[PDB]
Amino acid sequence: SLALSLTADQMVSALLDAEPPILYSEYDPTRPFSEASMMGLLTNLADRELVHMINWAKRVPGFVDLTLHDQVHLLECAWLEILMIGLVWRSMEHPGKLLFAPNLLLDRNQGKCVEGMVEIFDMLLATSSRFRMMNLQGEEFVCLKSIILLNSGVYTFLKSLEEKDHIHRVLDKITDTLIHLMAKAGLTLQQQHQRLAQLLLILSHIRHMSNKGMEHLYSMKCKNVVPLSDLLLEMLDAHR
C-alpha cells in the first residue's frame, strides 16, 4: 500500500509536493468594507481552496486506499480545521495579522466588522503566535495537516473496522515521521517527545476553532444575508 512502505523522508517529500498553492481573494481595496462583503470574500476564498484541498487529500498517503464514503466523511469533518491551520501557517510571519490571502491581510480591528468574528480572529492569532514561538517547520506543518485529515473524523464512522485500522497505521506512520524530523533537527529524546506533544495539543485548539466557526457559519446561513457556495453548503450541512 505504498503509504506503509514509505520512508520518513519519502513521506515528507510526498506531503511537501502535494501542497496546494496560496490563492488570492477578490478583495477590491477601492470598495468600502461591509460585513456582507468581508464574509463574501472569505467564503469565496474558502470555496476555491476547497477544490485544491480535495485534490490535495487524494495525494495524502493512505487516503485513496479508503472507501469513497470514508473519504467523504473525513473531509466533511476536517475541511474547516484544514483551512484554518493553513491560514495560521500563512500568518506566522505576520504578527497581529491574518494572511487570508496575499492581497487580504487582516488584523484584529477588521474582524470587528463582523459580529462574533473578533473572537475567532483572536483564537487564530493566538495559534499563529504559538507556531511562531515553537518555530514550526514546513515539514512539521504538512504532517500536522495530514494528521487532521485522517484523525478528525475517525471516531464518527459494519465489519468495516479494517478502515479504522489502516487509518491508525498511517497515523502512526506520520508520528514516526515527525519524530524523525525532530531527531534530525538535533533534538534530544526528551525534546522530541515534548515537541511532539506540544504540536498535537495545538490540534485540540484547532478543533475548537473549527467547531465555533462552524457554529457561526451554520447560523449566518439561516440569516441568508451572505450566500454560501453549493460545496460549502453540503460541507456545512454535514455538521448538522
Binding site: 480535495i54 469513497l68 467523504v72 473531509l75 453540503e234
Partner: peptide, 10 residues
C-alpha cells in the same frame, strides 16, 4: 450524488 463525493471520484 454529493458534490464532494463527485469531486473525489473525478
Amino acid at each position: 450524488h454529493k458534490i464532494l463525493h463527485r469531486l473525489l471520484q473525478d
